[PDB]
Amino acid sequence: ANPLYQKHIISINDLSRDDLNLVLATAAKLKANPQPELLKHKVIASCFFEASTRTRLSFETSMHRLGASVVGFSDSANTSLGKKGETLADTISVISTYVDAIVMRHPQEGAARLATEFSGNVPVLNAGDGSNQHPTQTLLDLFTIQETQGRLDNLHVAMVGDLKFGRTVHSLTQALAKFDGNRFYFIAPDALAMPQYILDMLDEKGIAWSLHSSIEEVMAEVDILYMTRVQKERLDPSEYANVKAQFVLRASDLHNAKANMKVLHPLPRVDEIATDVDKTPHAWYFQQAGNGIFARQALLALVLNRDLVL
Amino acid sequence: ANPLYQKHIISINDLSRDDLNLVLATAAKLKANPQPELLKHKVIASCFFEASTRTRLSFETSMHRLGASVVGFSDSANTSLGKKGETLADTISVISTYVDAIVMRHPQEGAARLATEFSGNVPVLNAGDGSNQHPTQTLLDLFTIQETQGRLDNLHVAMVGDLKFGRTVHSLTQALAKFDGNRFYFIAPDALAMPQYILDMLDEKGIAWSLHSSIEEVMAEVDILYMTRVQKERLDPSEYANVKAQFVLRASDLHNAKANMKVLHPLPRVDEIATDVDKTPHAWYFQQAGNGIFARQALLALVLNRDLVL
Amino acid sequence: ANPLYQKHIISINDLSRDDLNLVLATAAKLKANPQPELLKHKVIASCFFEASTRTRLSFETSMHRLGASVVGFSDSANTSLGKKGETLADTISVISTYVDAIVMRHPQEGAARLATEFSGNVPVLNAGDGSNQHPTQTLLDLFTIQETQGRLDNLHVAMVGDLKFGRTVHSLTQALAKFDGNRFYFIAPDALAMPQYILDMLDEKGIAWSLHSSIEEVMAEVDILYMTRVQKERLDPSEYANVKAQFVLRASDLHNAKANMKVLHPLPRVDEIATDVDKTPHAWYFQQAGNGIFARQALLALVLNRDLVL
Amino acid sequence: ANPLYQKHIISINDLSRDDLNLVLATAAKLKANPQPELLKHKVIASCFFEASTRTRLSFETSMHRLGASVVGFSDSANTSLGKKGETLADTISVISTYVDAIVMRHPQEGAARLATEFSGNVPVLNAGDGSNQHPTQTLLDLFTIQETQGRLDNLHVAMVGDLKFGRTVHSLTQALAKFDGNRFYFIAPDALAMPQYILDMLDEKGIAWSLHSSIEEVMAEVDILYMTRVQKERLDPSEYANVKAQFVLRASDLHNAKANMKVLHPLPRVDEIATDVDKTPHAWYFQQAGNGIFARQALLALVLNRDLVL
Amino acid sequence: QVEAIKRGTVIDHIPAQIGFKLLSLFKLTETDQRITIGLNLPSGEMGRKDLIKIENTFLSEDQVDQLALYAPQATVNRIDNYEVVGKSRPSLPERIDNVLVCPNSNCISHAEPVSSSFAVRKRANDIALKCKYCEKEFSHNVVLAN
Amino acid sequence: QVEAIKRGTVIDHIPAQIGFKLLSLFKLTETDQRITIGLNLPSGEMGRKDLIKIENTFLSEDQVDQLALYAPQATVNRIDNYEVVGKSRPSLPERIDNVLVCPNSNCISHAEPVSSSFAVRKRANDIALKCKYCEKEFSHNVVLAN
């Protein structure tokens, strides 16, 4: 028995450091020597009740690189099931009989958690409920800051953008807070700053953090620079433009930057990272996205295997 | 040669008792010892000109559990083919050249029957035309009343709901009418009762049947209780509520019920079967749905195999 | 003071024979000698929360033939008010301050009745709630069977069609049941026949009625022949066609018909009355529709006038 | 000549105290003795390029109570003009030839201001551009706090809600800042508070203002209580509920309130003012909405008249 | 008959497992003072029926006919001045306001700030209850599920 | 202390105008036998607080810690064997199941056949209650409106 066999992986704070460490170490491994027919003969469901094709094409290639078969759907208010009146509970109750693992994204929160109550023995991977968890993204964010920095501890890691509603930076902080040292720099518009329940948590485990106005005051100290979009509607048409440019990253700013330093972005970007950064060696968002394959493979293999032979 | 090799399975009264018996016996078998690469290398089309994802995810897993590959579509008025003006005849004429078996659901009746005229050697499985046939559902309804009652004869089988427009209960009666003994109890609102061409048929083969007002007068005699939804628009806002509750099945009513007795439902339910029935051992609709895999596998294997080696 | 001044006219059984008689006699009158600037300076709201343009163009011309001004809307899920979350109660509460009479059609039942609770002094005319009242239609149906038969009593009046869900024939029977003698003939498909709460009512006031299979057995006795559509979905694709043609009225059947006899239809027809009937002198549906102007004018004048000077 | 004849009324800070005083005094007047055929024979355009029916039904009744005729449109991406490619400049250039006054709401800002450049002699009333002006609302907000408090000076006036993006409370402050004394109390969620360019302006003309957490600390001092909705998306699912209830006003809180005190709301409300407030004599939002007729009439009469004879 | 204060309105003999429900629908707890709730005892003309007194209140004659479609037979005998001076028992009213819900799903009363109101009919045989708003007459057993 | 049967579980001292509510949320009327509901009296360490006994039941230690965020202080002293043999008083549990509703409008628990469940935290200062399903931590005063 694996520590994750039959487990439903729904949250990042559902996991412990030691199996986060088992997810990462395994990913590094399958990346090294691929296992093409590991999940041969297993049938997996890609239930995207909420369309999102960048998470879907990633997940679905990951099933396939391990030899699994895929049945599923991108719903856009038209899928007969889990729609007319049929409860999402009763949809999972009939999917759970013909597949071997459900993958699931949905608009409402705790959807995957509800699925867990009706899937029975079937594991549920949560591709993102709503405003709540998307642990597979976080498991590819940590796999990338470690594949490049060589460690998940005692690092300087900046967090740029909409830090209030930015669930992707919320949950990268909680997972990195299970490791030691680790400095945090939050650069955010006055009004979209990091919510203070995370800052509360950061202080109880005694983690070091600052608050900054721009990437201008942060750049020579920084190992990771996790970038994220600031939405126009969240600020004020004028307040948006005055502060806007402090949160854009052209390559001009990559002057003081350390050699190790990596610019990561959850994607899709629009304009807060400029095309002259893509050439620079510190740009690693496209590779961050490629590694998502490796992190999502690992969950699929641990969850559907006892004897993991790699 | 199999009795069903190259056959297009379009209706339930297209079949005879002896190959209904060959479909069922085979299903019981593939369920026992799976044949994962039986249809290895065959390519099958999932043509759902009418979306329906619960029939589609079932069919598509069934192709895959036998190792087949799937290409296809859920159309919702946007698929270029068999749309702009291209006749459904001429769509089948070009699909029939690259696949090995078509699976097909459509809004108009006799669509699959039309496909049969242009597919040539390619078998056509009918996933439901319109108001007419859906024989794959019936082949999983009989496989389930027999997996649980141990026989398809001399049984008491209730039929609850919208029995007039309920095509799923129409065609379960005709198929069960090819077997002996078999009592029938139709519980239906005065205005949505069982159409009298079926009742006519039932009398010529001398089959026993009653008519009831509620599951209250039927419950201790009943082996199967095939449940189905009564639509609000089919009755009258007031006439709906007066009679409504006689057609709901909470577990309260499962008191006199025999030990064998199974509550089956075609799904999706909404509220005519209550959540306290799901715990009770007589609830078998979720398993009924799971067995649909086994009944649909069987058609795929008989239809694409001469020498069926199981 | 008029007996109807400030009254909200919401149901037909809200009215009594004597003011039904005051609505009709007034209509006959305004038709005779028009009063073009009677409602001069009044502002009336055409609130069609449910679009319906044939009721709307009628109502709106009727306001205008009396010199009133009109503000309003045809909503089709896009009108900011009484939509986003603003209660229909709170919409009426602000419309009621700038208009002098509300006209209102809506999808849910008792909508106009709810309006009555928040309009204050403002009268509410109900252009049709849902499945419930549309008294303005009935007030133009009676004005037409009387303009042609010369009386609303001791008449033979047929009722053809979907008599179960046909709210227009429901409410024509209740209003004609306030008058004496009056025979009723209901021709309807077995399954869509006249609901038996009306038949119950008809027996307590001792009104004479029959039940027939076709207009074939009714035609020489009949004064009015109120025609109405039989929907394809309400019967059964086959049951529809077998019985269908007994409910169509071509002019062939107008052979035995009395000289007085009038063929009325609520409209829109489709095919249950044929184009060779339109030439025949018994066709009066187009004139029935024209008189709707006169019946709706009358409510507007009685409701917004004390001293009606005509 | 009137001081407003031929003027395009586009902003509230486009106006001066003395003609704000001429708009208000005139409204009080037309309310007193109506002028039904004042604008007789003038044709006015209701151009709602952006639907909004509560502003439209108000404006359109106001044209009509002065005897004017109305032509126009509620566009919802389908109006041929000012759509396919035809510039809003070139739409106004052809409307400006057949009407006498344009009324206009649009999604983009400065739309009405652009219209002013192509209408020529035709006045333009701005029914709301985007995020910018809606001076007609403000001219009915001041007409109501003065019809009830008897003065627009040295008043205590609270401002509750989403004060950051709340353009209706922005512009009520600037207009009330042209008058003397006047205290201001802004009750707002920490994150949606009053933008500090207004607070800057308030300090230069030396106007008194506070900041509060709830209507609990404000109620005995307050003359007006201008209420406005706090949007769920603007805060955080949790941060919304913790603070939510301080911004709801049930009638429980109307205990200390002065006798004069009026609760005004721009509408539509949803739930931040409760139905037990509607009975209480301090509820004046429904009357606030009714007076919008009087304030909008006044602009139409001043703008299309030199010799205003009332 | 169980221990209870002199003076108030005594409500008695409520049928099989109602009583909590009656305290729920007519809102008898909002207006405070000692609410001697009996419940789940043996009592008069029964020997297994619910019942409960209150202090200081005084339900009206229309206030008591509201119980009618829930109990019929149920004493409400006032303990006036000092003691049990005024017997009563509900029949069936002419209009049941608030409390019950229209079974028509498309009624506007599910969406609104409006008081639910059904006109009562049939003194016995199958008490019918038509909606004020959508004018649909359903059986009372049907509205009484809620 | 008012008139009540020997033997059952006595629930006592409920705070200002709760008590009907507790009989509502924990469903104490479903499981019949004599339900001596006191209510709206003067009682212990109060002289104006609600209270109520039952017969034949026997709430568990976890069954009584459920009251915690509604009363805290409230005796539940069993009248075992023949008489009052076993005192108690709730503290605050580790998990409140059913009963409360998530204030997040977009939670799946408003749409489903799932039991509502909040993990309890902060022994006092501002008791926080996170959802099982959407993992949002709201204040208890906020969930307690319902």
Ligand SMILES: [Zn+2]
């Ligand atoms: Zn109703």
Ligand SMILES: [Zn+2]
């Ligand atoms: Zn939740």
